Amino acid sequence: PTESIVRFPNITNLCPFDEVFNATTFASVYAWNRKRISNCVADYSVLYNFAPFFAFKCYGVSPTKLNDLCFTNVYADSFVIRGNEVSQIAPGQTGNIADYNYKLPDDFTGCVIAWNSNKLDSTVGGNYNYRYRLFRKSKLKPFERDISTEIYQAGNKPCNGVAGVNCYFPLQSYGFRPTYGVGHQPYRVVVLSFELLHAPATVCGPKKSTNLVKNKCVNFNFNGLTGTGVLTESNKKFLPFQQFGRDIADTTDAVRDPQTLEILDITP
């Protein structure tokens, strides 16, 4: 530990997290509008400056450990759900959202955030623009698109485009009243998905950088991977697909420097 080297991708840009969290109109549980965020440095101070979360609980990572780690693919999914069923977005849970509106895969490494949104996402006549599904042919698969709303019949008699008893209307749209209790008030929710291995990061926290010193014992940090050791010039060839290597022992042994594309060893 003679020094402390930390190198992250040199690219920098304010992430579109601000416009993701501040959109004037969010999508429904009917269609989770998933938009890609990449090629920017991720800063969570704007998220903290945003409205106080009613429930910010995050899996596979901790909000303290959130800033240093570099995420490869971040995907902000937005939707509006009933305050009663806020706890249902957690994986391993069942509920109307879970059965038919949308699923979260059990092995989820991301953040879910919700905040009371009757402040401005409620109209006295109700926000019927937001809709949900009572009925579906089966259980919806995790992270699977569902954008079709065709007339469904519970009974054996086919509908043939005709609605009636045992053949209920396809989607139900809830109109939030300001008078509705906190349980029934609308909630704006944002869901983030992360991936940490075998991919280029292109999404990192603000940590600046310092050049490495070859053949010097350092406690390094590469793309959020914390390790200590001597950095040695290497001759083993890596294809563009893989960035950091692996040994028999399953710990890291090789890495390609983000700023200068060149493969380094992680020998002790």
């Epitope: 401005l120 006295v124 008078t179 906190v182």
Partner: antibody, heavy 116, light 107 residues
Framework: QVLLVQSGAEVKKPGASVKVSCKAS????????LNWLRQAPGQGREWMGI????????SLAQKFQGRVTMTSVTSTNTVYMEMVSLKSEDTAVYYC?????????????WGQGTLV | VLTQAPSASGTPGQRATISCSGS????????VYWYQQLPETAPKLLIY???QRPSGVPDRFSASKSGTSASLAISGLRSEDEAEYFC?????????????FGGGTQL
Amino acid sequence: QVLLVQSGAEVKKPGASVKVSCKASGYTFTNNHLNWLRQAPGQGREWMGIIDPRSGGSSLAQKFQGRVTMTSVTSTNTVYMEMVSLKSEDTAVYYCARGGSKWYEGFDNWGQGTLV
Amino acid sequence: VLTQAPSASGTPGQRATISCSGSYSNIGNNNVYWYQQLPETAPKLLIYNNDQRPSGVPDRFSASKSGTSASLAISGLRSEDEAEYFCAAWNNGLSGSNWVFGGGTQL
């Protein structure tokens, strides 16, 4: 100047239906909301509910939901209330309140009220 | 639910304040706005969005909130102007959400 029409004072009769109107002035009717709260002497103040001017929709407090009906009409520039099974306790003074959007919780004008 | 508020007696040429007592759901999260009233007179808006007075209200007055308590200060309160005041905050608690007004003690 913003002016709100006050319905005249009315005799209170148990088991009767009354209507009260508040006609807007000093502003365009549809742009800004109008909601209602009442005062009972010897007690605190309480809020009826809010009606949308442009859409005409009404949202009413659960505490007194169902006893009162509110309908907003463009030409009338006013909203009506209904009273079903008027009990002697419920008779009181009722104020109209005018404000902006829903998040603009602050009411910027006031109603004269009805008292006998 | 309603703010308890204290009781006051005016003293000429003296700054006076009115404080409200509410829950976290009543006043902590939702901003408050004040309403100065005099007998045989209609209500009047006093402060707007919990931090500033509306346009046209005299600038001598200042008000602020500290959690459950919001202090409405009157610059050199006069006994003739002195009257009971009352908070006006939005409540959203359990199955019910509504505007809650805590009538202060008679002044």
